[PDB]
Design an enzyme around this catalytic site. Structure first.
Site, short mmCIF file in Angstrom:
data_model
loop_
_atom_site.label_atom_id
_atom_site.label_comp_id
_atom_site.label_asym_id
_atom_site.label_seq_id
_atom_site.Cartn_x
_atom_site.Cartn_y
_atom_site.Cartn_z
N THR A 285 -36.69 -48.55 -93.20
CA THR A 285 -35.76 -49.29 -94.08
C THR A 285 -36.01 -48.80 -95.49
OG1 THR A 285 -37.33 -51.13 -94.31
CG2 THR A 285 -35.61 -51.38 -92.65
N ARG B 86 -45.64 -53.22 -88.05
CA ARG B 86 -44.62 -52.29 -88.55
C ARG B 86 -43.71 -51.86 -87.40
NH1 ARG B 86 -41.23 -48.81 -89.68
NH2 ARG B 86 -41.35 -47.41 -91.50
C1 LIG Z 1 -43.38 -46.30 -88.06
C2 LIG Z 1 -44.66 -45.52 -88.25
C3 LIG Z 1 -45.16 -45.34 -89.49
N1 LIG Z 1 -46.34 -44.66 -89.66
C4 LIG Z 1 -46.87 -44.39 -90.99
C5 LIG Z 1 -46.33 -43.02 -91.41
C6 LIG Z 1 -46.19 -43.14 -92.96
O1 LIG Z 1 -47.45 -42.88 -93.60
P1 LIG Z 1 -47.60 -41.35 -94.16
O2 LIG Z 1 -46.48 -41.02 -95.04
O3 LIG Z 1 -48.94 -41.41 -95.04
O4 LIG Z 1 -47.81 -40.37 -92.93
C7 LIG Z 1 -46.00 -44.66 -93.15
C8 LIG Z 1 -44.62 -45.07 -93.61
O5 LIG Z 1 -44.68 -46.49 -93.52
P2 LIG Z 1 -43.62 -47.24 -94.40
O6 LIG Z 1 -42.17 -46.72 -94.13
O7 LIG Z 1 -43.81 -48.65 -94.05
O8 LIG Z 1 -43.94 -47.08 -95.97
O9 LIG Z 1 -46.39 -45.33 -91.93
C9 LIG Z 1 -47.02 -44.21 -88.60
O10 LIG Z 1 -48.08 -43.54 -88.74
N2 LIG Z 1 -46.56 -44.38 -87.33
C10 LIG Z 1 -45.39 -45.07 -87.14
O11 LIG Z 1 -44.98 -45.17 -85.99
CA LIG Z 2 -39.97 -48.35 -95.00
#
Ligand SMILES: Cc1cn([C@H]2C[C@H](OP(=O)(O)O)[C@@H](COP(=O)(O)O)O2)c(=O)[nH]c1=O
Ligand SMILES: [Ca+2]
Length: 129
Positions: A35, A29
């Site tokens: 996005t 990720r």
């Molecule tokens: C980019 C990033 C996302 N995330 C987590 C936070 C969000 O989960 P929570 O809402 O449960 O806290 C999720 C969003 O991912 P996506 O945008 O891929 O759906 O990914 C991290 O924990 N650390 C990061 O650096």
């Molecule tokens: Ca996203």
């Protein structure tokens, strides 16, 4: 920070890609960006952009930041480069992602991505249109 080689397995969406890293699959990720969902405006365009960028690259690299390398869902967290161009920055500069999820201790390229976002916004590109 340092760039390590990885091999594309498959594009997934605008900010997630599956890579073979040191011989094991990683769902990476993109750090510092968000996005749109595929069902939101600019979602398909964000997925298409990242897919084309990673599938056309000769050389993909992964660069972890200084903090956590895996998120709470088991995804790797990194900056991904495609023939030397950072996917995270390119998405932002195209107004296909916003700077987001900026957590202390994993924010090395924050200023760089915010510069990009500022330009995309000035140009009223895509999300900012
Ligand atoms: C980019 C990033 C996302 N995330 C987590 C936070 C969000 O989960 P929570 O809402 O449960 O806290 C999720 C969003 O991912 P996506 O945008 O891929 O759906 O990914 C991290 O924990 N650390 C990061 O650096
Ligand atoms: Ca996203």
């Amino acid at each position: 920070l340092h760039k390590e080689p990885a091999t594309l397995i498959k594009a997934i969406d605008g900010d997630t890609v599956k890579l073979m890293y040191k011989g094991q699959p990683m769902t990476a990720r993109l750090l510092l960006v968000d996005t749109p969902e595929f069902n939101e405006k600019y979602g398909p365009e964000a997925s298409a952009f990242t897919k084309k960028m990673v599938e056309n690259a000769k050389k993909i690299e992964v660069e972890f930041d200084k903090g956590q390398r895996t998120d709470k869902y088991g995804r790797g967290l990194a900056y991904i480069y495609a023939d030397g161009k950072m996917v995270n920055e390119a998405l932002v500069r195209q107004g296909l992602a916003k700077v987001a999820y900026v957590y202390k201790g994993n924010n090395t390229h924050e200023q760089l991505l915010r510069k990009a976002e500022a330009q995309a916004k000035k140009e009223k590109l895509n999300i900012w249109s």
